[PDB]
Ligand binder design. Structure first.
Ligand SMILES: [Zn+2]
Ligand SMILES: [Zn+2]
Lengths: 4, 136, 135, 4
């Protein structure tokens, strides 16, 4: 996933 | 025994945070795997898959079945002190633990400081735009 | 540090010692009391009352030549604190969790024994009253 | 010392  | 503030140091407490976590058996990012990586489940309406490291407070979303939480962790927060801890929690020394928690307390202040600054910049952006519109 | 496990800290145990008699010159100093696990919990009757934080054994009538550790093994010999040859912050979390667990058990047994005594004394009064009624 |  990735940063908000 | 650990007070509410130190419960997240417990893998089984982190696991218990994952309620309605979509990625179960077959997946690489199971609740157990997330928890072993230091993540807790902190869902919102906008982001129901939002997970956050308990130690460095990095928040990640857009999780996919084959995601390896550890690797996503090293990737997006390489300096996290929890990553360096190679021994189980219960083999930690009380001195060691108290050091880790000092790091964590700093991490949370730093994180709270960054948010306050981001909010501050946002507000200033609105004021500038409103000034420009009136300058016209 | 959480208020609940301060008694595990020697410096905190020393602090509990308010207007403790027996200072320099005596073997039973606040520092040596605390080293032995003792806490100062003075009544009005006995402002001489010291209690182990771990096994909760209460001792009074302290003598200046008393070795706190020795008064401790003698009166509460099963106390697990006596077997801890390690400073606190060198304690492993597992070791600590396991000690705090036994201390919690020690507390209940003490409270349980107290309740038992109070009940038994109450029972004896009731019986006596009833015996007296028969006459 | 002595046991209360
Ligand atoms: Zn982290
Ligand atoms: Zn004791």
């Amino acid at each position: 996933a990735v940063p908000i | 025994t650990l007070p509410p503030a130190w419960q997240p140091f417990l893998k089984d407490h982190r696991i218990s945070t994952f309620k309605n976590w979509p990625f179960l058996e077959g997946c690489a990012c199971t609740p157990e795997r997330m928890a072993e990586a230091g993540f807790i489940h902190c869902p919102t309406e906008n982001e129901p898959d939002l997970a956050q490291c308990f130690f460095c407070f990095k928040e990640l979303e857009g999780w996919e079945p084959d995601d390896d939480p550890i690797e996503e962790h090293k990737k997006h927060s390489s300096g996290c002190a929890f990553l360096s801890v190679k021994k189980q929690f219960e083999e930690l020394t009380l001195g060691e633990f108290l050091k880790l928690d000092r790091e964590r307390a700093k991490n949370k202040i730093a994180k709270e400081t960054n948010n306050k600054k981001k909010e501050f910049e946002e507000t200033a952006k609105k004021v500038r735009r409103a000034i420009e519109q009136l300058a016209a």
